[PDB]
Amino acid sequence: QGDIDSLKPKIAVNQAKQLKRLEDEMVVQQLMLGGISNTKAQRTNPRVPGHG
Amino acid sequence: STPNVLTNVAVSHSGEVDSLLIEKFNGKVREQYLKGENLLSHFQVETVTGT
Q1: How far apart are CA A23 and CA A30, in angstroms?
Q2: How many angstroms away from the CA of A8 is the closest CA of chain B?
Q3: Cβ contact (<8 Å) for B51 and A1?
Q4: A38: number of Cβ within 10 Å
Q5: Which long-range contacts does B10-14 make (Cβ < 8 Å, 24+ apart)?
Q6: Are A1 and B47 spatial neighbours (Cβ–Cβ below 8 Å)?
Q7: C-beta separation of B51 from A1 below 8 A
């Protein structure tokens, strides 16, 4: 009684887009945190005595 | 004369089991009758999908 032509493949392709969007959003969030967390003011000491 | 000790293979030497003769089954499976009235055969019924 769905009356919808395909329903199920549409729901599947919607789920795929949801997962892809979250995958990209997580990467952007991690880049932002990596940028903001360690800025020479909070760390005060590099991970290895050489790098910046 | 005649036989007077005639051998029967249907009697057990011990008293544990009685007959030593398994009965057959040959189908004869009985079910509830429930005759088919089929009143709905008179009426028109076309299956519909959705709506």
Answers
A1: 11
A2: 15
A3: yes
A4: 13
A5: none
A6: no
A7: yes
Q: Which residues contact B10 (CB under 8 A, 6 or more apart)?
A: B19, B20, B21
Q: Name the resolution in angstroms.
A: 3.9
Closest by Cα among A27, A51, A22 to A35? A27
| Cα B50 to chain centroid, rounded | 45
Closest chain A residue to B50, measured at CA: A1
Sign of the alpha-carbon dihedral angle for A5, A8, A9, A11: positive
Q: Give the minimum alpha-carbon distance from B44 to chain A in angstroms, rounded to a whole number.
A: 21
Buried b (16+ CB within 10 A) or exposed e, B3-19: eeeeeeeeeeeeeeeee
User: In terms of CA atoms, which chain A residue is nearest residue B48?
Assistant: A1
Q: How far off is chain A from B51, nearest CA to CA, in Å?
A: 6
